[PDB]
Symmetry: D2
Subunit: 445 residues, 4 copies
């Protein structure tokens, strides 16, 4: 049997050590009384859309932050990342004639899993930084001791962020008439920028035609659905925000529409699998090179016992060198056992190089290579390449190498070569969108 | 005061001499008891659409037969002419983003005005052929004596023709998914054929996008309004088919949605002006080189005393040599007197050359030149070039010279160089549509 | 193998004896060259709607003339019968929340099957009157000899009638704002008239609500689909109007959307079954008391070999005394053999009493009793009561007894007590519609 | 000239005395960097809807808290108040056929104007409670000293509240299929409860009809616009949340869609008028008995110099005894000077009785009397009664006397008889909605 607190009886990885259990429990009770971020009916609607993807009738775009931070809590940052997501979505929707399910890694993507539980600099060892929802990035004792009050700050940043995202999605910002406005000003003077401009002009002509034909009325042209997701890592936060549906009695984790389990926390007997087992949300699991086909099926039996086609997103992150060797055997097992899953590529988390110094690099060419091979593997196996899962930014930076132009090495990006990972910029994201749109069009041809 | 028979008190041109007045009256009474071709509410809807054109928010496409004939009463002929009209309309709608009001010279365009009331061949003089609704094309006494029973045959051909047209317009034939099917098979292996194909592909992509966005539902994508028109020439026919609106009591000529007065029958004190004065239909007048600005205004005072913007279509047919010299003074008068009119170009009837032999030629280059100059004159005067009025066919023939390829001289086309006039073929009609679409796009830019 | 003329090799009932075979063949060739009444795509759309009925998601309303006549060829008669059909449809649609498929016995219901091939009055025996498409109602030699030219007159009346019906259905007459206007002025000063008025007011409030909510735009509120049907009896007419679909090559009888075989002409080895076997239209068969379950299945095997759910309408006409005894065994056979059929009640043709004099009476109470029992039988068997098939008129007459008020005995109705049968009037039709709407609401509850 | 800080140069009423100016300024800067609650485009959309009301084509429903509190920050409270607003809106929309603009006094209605700047209990005098955004309700020094950190707590409660409201409005909670679910369980066993049930059933029948007709698709049936409003009282909060529109450069107060000036702070030379003068939001002004016609016009000149019809809501709160004597002269002045305003009734704030003890009572019968007279006055003057502005709750309490049943005297309601004012409950709100719906229907008849 399941409860929102049943995870606490299981073995668990990646959790902080709080210094005062009672203080933690007080903050958890405060949070438990605060309004949810999402309505259960919305999570059901995302499941319905996931089922369209799983059936090959739509495509899942999931994108946003590596890890959101309290020091970057602005409307401009939120807006500009949303613009990139809209630009990618409209490229794929128009060029491929394919509905796109838009899910942001936003409004709650704070907690970060770490390779090591501690960090050492020149003879001093402190607890690892686990994201702003747990502790601070500064290498000092006060910063690194987990502080339960950070749960509430994360909640407050999430409600402000999602309120604004809902306002943009429904209130006119995402109206198709605004297609040119979604292109960030630093996408310019290039073949890619021209390509988007031309596509946007084709959309203008489409809308003018639909107006001349007597439509243009349709609310679908003026708004779009937008959903949120994050890794369900800090289960104290997730439990506090887990709530029963008023109508059905069924539990939903209402911190976000979609929750996923990370590659380091997907132990079948573990806490994270136990938490998501019993919520009604659509959910995801990160599937890295260590996953074999036997243990994948066992995980699916726990996380989707009814084999519902909108329930489960398998987010494959193998690396450009391993996707061809590892993915086919997993697909074959799913096909053999008749399982309904939404397959996505995370082409980023398997393609990070960490130097001895700790400095992280991601080569955009390896990113693109993994995406190309992911579609190739699905094509060979007769299965459906259903989505893309990326870390990106609307900021005018270059964090991944191998792009058209060289990396920028701004201090604001230092976080994204050490504690976090390198994100795609708008140019890279747009190039990826065009690649996917061409690939989808050929699949649907 | 007005009645459906008040025209009979006026001087009249272009009427046949029937041999038995009582026989004529019996056929008129039979017809008066037959159902109308159109519903008054439909004529009102066309007036509403004419008002959109007059205001510069739409464009009027009027096209079809020089004169319909009893010997060419087929579904294939009707369908193929309708295809050309759809192809022209969709080109202008998509390329210019402009609603197109589609009106066919069909389902009643039988009566023909003639330069001479008789015809002489080798010492024998007979009454002129005035169209199948009056008499027969054969040069012999029996054929040429007006036969009132031909009124009923024309009525029956009209109901069959319009029934089929309504079925095509509403029943799926004009669904935008059928855009490729409207291109006749002899439009091929040319730059123009490729141009339409490419536009049709853009429409497919538009519809696929609208489906991906969640529309594609809209009935407007599956059907289109279609209206009929003919010259109100044989007033016996028009009177019999003139009926009172059930709801409003007001009279409509229900032989067609739109009726026009020909260039030879527009005498301000004459029968034809008197007939149309008192019906509620949208109406047209042919305006040739003989029209001065004073008498135009006097005509408008009679035909549109309330200055209703959906009432009156001025159909300008000057010839490519005269449109620049004659049209500006007419527009200036309309602007000065604040009159609301829909200006159309008939670029055909002012560009016919009749040799001493009687053989008629129309140079497509002169046709295009008059259209170009018509738009030029409106541009210079600040008025709106609101429509095109053409004679065309879906048959695989070439009747007008100066086209990409030479004229065909098929016997079926002999009618159209003697009694009737040369029609545009599908290639010419499509070339014209692209010219207009480019011109409209530049007007709306 | 099948052709439009393959029926001519089979045994045939109910056909006229034409005096000149060559003359008949000339008229058939003339007709074969005239435009069709319907487009094959439309017949396909009606099949799609029949499939909705068969699945229990809609209801079939079929109504119109016993037999159309040349002497009653008016717009008013056509309009007023259409009003009754609209009133019945809107009652069932609004009160039961059930889509209604509207099919008129109109624009071609001329040929009549007869009990006897001749008629005798005071020592003189003449061929039976078989409807105006064959011969005349007058009891004299000239009238009764079949005249092939009547095929063309029937065609011409049909195109005029259907043109007008299409105009009403699509052009505004059937806009839901016109709901009060469909009530004929002689429905007044009664509980039934008040009941319709109140329902019409509820529709007004619905439309005002939808306008206030931001809809009211929808073309579905302004137009409705309308289809035609008649008994395929005079196969010469049907063959001439049978045409190949341009796109698919498949044959459709394009005289009407739906054709049915009469109770006297449904011999499994006969001409009428052979004709309809090979056309693509939705079709019907009249099923009277003489039908057993074995021969029904054999008929279905011929007429619907692929068991398509939109193909076949079984039109049950048993009489109020026999429907309970005869229908259950037929339903059981269809259920046992897994056949997909649309079951309708014709509650009129099994409830006619013919006196020794020849005078026909129909008791409206028996009509209602058969309808009630038809729904009862379906309820008991777990099958779907899918439609109603009636003979009705918009004329201010009373032809069936047992109505609220007594029969009128107008001369115009004498036809409908001798050669034709008594029709329901508007009051009776409305009462029936309310009965059906209540019954459907209880089925869907 | 105007800036977001120009109010600071003007004389000002109702402001707190903060103990540390620098601390206040630090919190203001923090807030100034946080995301806005609303998008400027949304405020423009509300102006567009206000213009519909002003023109007599819609009705404004504004309702919610007297003053929101930190101790009542729940999803249930937010949801249940939203249910009441939906129930009122759907009653007026369906029964009157009138679009309703829905605006909640929610997500920011914290600051309260007070009659006295201090409060004395048994020889101790402390600063007045001014709402949770300023200080605490407890009568003690620590509670009553203004604390600038409360600005941030109010912001955080507002983003959580509006996020949830947006989720309900767009995400399915406000789908018209949910009409029964908006009725709170304690509305039952009464004529009023039956009346709503019956109306909800009529809506179900409407939706079933629209489904049967082929609609039911429309996104307008599934979602609704919802906007927020509060009194712009604490100008420090408003200034921090005032932001420039990205596209137009123009300033909007992005704390809420609509802001109003209270009856005690509407001095024409004062700070509150100065603040709202220069923002682009739709705005309101409370108009009490002290307002004369000369000073109203002068206020309108400042707050709506362009006489835009969507800009200004005059919220009339006179008391049931004074509305008839005071309102007509104000309307006459507006009509004489050609001003475009949206007239609303606040029938609550002029109908409070404060005993010597301080205990506040509001008689629901006086509330209804003022509303009735407000509509009467507009009817007499030829102007439009455009909206209602109420304080209400979804809690199962009775705070206003004169209701069907007696007041409850729950401790949770003690706030609403001392510091705040008595709110309407769901029964009272529904009764009011029916009164208004009947009145609107008669206006539109
Ligand atoms: N009904 C729309 C679109 C449309 C349908 N079929 C068409 C054919 C040609 C042009 C446009 C259309 C219109 O008339 O504009
Ligand atoms: N609402 C549609 C169309 C749409 C609106 N805005 C968008 C932005 C991007 C992509 C599509 C859209 C959809 O989500 O598909
Ligand atoms: N969207 C429509 C209909 C609607 C949906 N939900 C509502 C709730 C109440 C009133 C109306 C509605 C409107 O706002 O009018
Ligand atoms: N077009 C819809 C609604 C409709 C329009 N006119 C009608 C007349 C009767 C019944 C329904 C309708 C339908 O056929 O259902
Ligand atoms: Cl909750
Ligand atoms: Cl690579
Ligand atoms: Cl008529
Ligand atoms: Cl030329
Ligand atoms: Cl054909
Ligand atoms: Cl009986
Ligand atoms: Cl901002
Ligand atoms: Cl009172
Ligand atoms: Co990362
Ligand atoms: Co001509
Ligand atoms: Co009969
Ligand atoms: Co108050």
């Amino acid at each position: 049997s399941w409860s929102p607190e049943s995870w606490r009886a299981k073995p668990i990885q990646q959790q902080p050590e709080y210094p005062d259990a009672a203080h933690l429990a007080r903050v958890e009770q405060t949070l438990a009384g605060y309004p949810p971020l999402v309505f259960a009916g919305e999570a059901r609607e995302l499941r319905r859309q996931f089922a369209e993807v799983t059936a090959g009738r739509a495509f899942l775009l999931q994108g946003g932050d590596c890890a959101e931070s309290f020091a970057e809590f602005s409307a401009a940052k939120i807006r500009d990342t949303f613009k990139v997501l809209l630009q990618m979505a409209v490229v794929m929707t128009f060029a491929a004639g394919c509905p796109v399910v838009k899910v942001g890694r936003m409004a709650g993507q704070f907690a970060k899993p770490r390779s090591s539980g501690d960090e050492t600099q020149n003879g001093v060892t402190l607890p690892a930084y686990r994201g702003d929802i747990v502790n601070g990035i500064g290498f000092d004792e006060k910063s690194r001791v987990p502080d339960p009050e950070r749960l509430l700050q994360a909640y407050h940043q999430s409600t402000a962020s999602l309120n604004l995202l809902r306002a943009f999605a429904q209130g006119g910002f995402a109206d198709l008439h605004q297609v040119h406005r979604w292109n960030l000003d630093f996408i310019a003077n290039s073949a890619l920028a021209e390509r988007y401009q031309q596509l946007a002009d084709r959309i203008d002509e489409t809308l003018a035609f639909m107006r001349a034909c007597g439509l243009d009325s349709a609310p679908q042209l003026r708004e779009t659905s937008f959903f949120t997701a994050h890794e369900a890592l800090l289960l104290n936060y997730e439990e506090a925000l887990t709530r029963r549906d008023s109508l059905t009695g069924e539990w939903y984790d209402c911190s976000a529409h979609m929750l996923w389990i990370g590659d380091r926390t997907r132990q079948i007997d573990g806490a994270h699998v136990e938490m998501l087992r019993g919520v009604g949300n659509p959910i995801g699991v990160k599937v890295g090179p260590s996953m074999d086909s036997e243990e994948l099926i066992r995980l699916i039996d726990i996380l989707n016992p009814d084999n519902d086609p909108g329930r489960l997103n398998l987010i494959v992150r193998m690396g450009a060198d391993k996707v061809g060797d590892h993915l086919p055997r997993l697909i074959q097992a799913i096909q053999r056992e008749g399982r309904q899953v939404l397959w996505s590529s995370d082409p980023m988390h398997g393609n990070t190089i960490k130097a001895s110094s700790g400095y992280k690099t991601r080569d955009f060419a390896r990113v693109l290579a993994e995406v190309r091979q992911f579609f190739e593997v699905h094509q060979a196996e007769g299965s459906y390449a259903g989505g893309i899962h990326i870390e990106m930014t609307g900021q005018n930076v270059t964090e991944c190498i191998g792009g058209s132009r060289p990396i920028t090495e701004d201090g604001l990006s230092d976080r994204y070569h050490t504690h976090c990972d390198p994100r795609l910029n708008a140019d890279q994201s747009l190039e990826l969108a065009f690649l996917i749109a061409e690939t989808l069009k050929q699949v649907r041809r």
